[PDB]
Amino acid sequence: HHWGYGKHNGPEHWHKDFPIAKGERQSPVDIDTHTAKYDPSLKPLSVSYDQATSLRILNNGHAFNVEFDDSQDKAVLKGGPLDGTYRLIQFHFHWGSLDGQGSEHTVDKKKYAAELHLVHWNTKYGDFGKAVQQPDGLAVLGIFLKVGSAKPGLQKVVDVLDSIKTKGKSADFTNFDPRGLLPESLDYWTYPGSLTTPPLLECVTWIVLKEPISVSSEQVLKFRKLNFNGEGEPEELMVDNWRPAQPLKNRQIKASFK
Ligand SMILES: O=C1NS(=O)(=O)c2cc(-n3cc(CCO[C@H]4O[C@@H](CO)[C@@H](O)[C@H](O)[C@@H]4O)nn3)ccc21
Ligand SMILES: [Zn+2]
Ligand SMILES: [Zn+2]
DSSP states (O other): OOOSSSTTTSGGGGGGTOGGGGSSSOSOOEEOTTTSEEOTTOOOEEEEOTTOOEEEEEEOSSSEEEEEOOSSSSSEEEETTOOSOEEEEEEEEEEOSSTTOOOSSEETTBOOSEEEEEEEEEGGGSSHHHHTTSTTSEEEEEEEEEESSOOGGGHHHHHHGGGGOSTTOEEEOOSOOGGGGOOSOOOEEEEEEOOSSTTOOSOEEEEEESSOEEEOHHHHHHHTTOBSSOTTSOOOBOOOOOOOOOOOOSOOOEESOO
């Protein structure tokens, strides 16, 4: 397949099919905490997930997505740097082969073991496919994972992964509460960026939480048993499915906190 995370089709190759890979607002980035500026005009985040309706979990060959019913305002993100209402469509993770790497964003060059992306689209554009064509189409909440104590709210995800080992497999995944994946604090950094996988569209307001969540070694080990390949193809473990930091260029990272 034309893109992935291998030696021959990984991030350094993506620009050939997707020239925006070398664009002006690509993600992820390194968050230099001393250069980010506190913006007192930034509002607290409003995460309203009480009526979230998860539906399904899918191994798409690059990560696994937990998908939500986004046909109504059931789970929404508002406030912070955002104007308007953004609906939760899915979440997924990026992770490493080793605990020392796996996140996409970095903090003063520190890599975390993994990174959670809760993906939301701006309801003024009607559907996700139209939203990704707009500079304010998506809002992605990024949450770092470090290895330590288990995250209880993650275990229902971990335990279904055996049923979606290979690319193209899906399973029912109802009644999952994404609030169980949030840290205590909603302090954040924010900047304008892009999707971190092809087509790398420059449509994302990134909101990256300062406080990581802790997951156990056993939880992350279960992520690393997934496969990039389809069933009946040679096994390639789904690990190191992260894009490295891209140049910040003409962008400022703002902090919600001092
Ligand atoms: O790399 C990323 N950072 S991300 O977390 O914001 C994120 C979120 C997503 N999602 C995609 C979908 C449903 C299908 O949509 C896809 O099909 C067309 C529109 O329908 C394309 O225009 C476009 O390829 C789009 O991806 N749900 N989430 C994919 C990648 C990334
Ligand atoms: Zn391909
Ligand atoms: Zn992602």
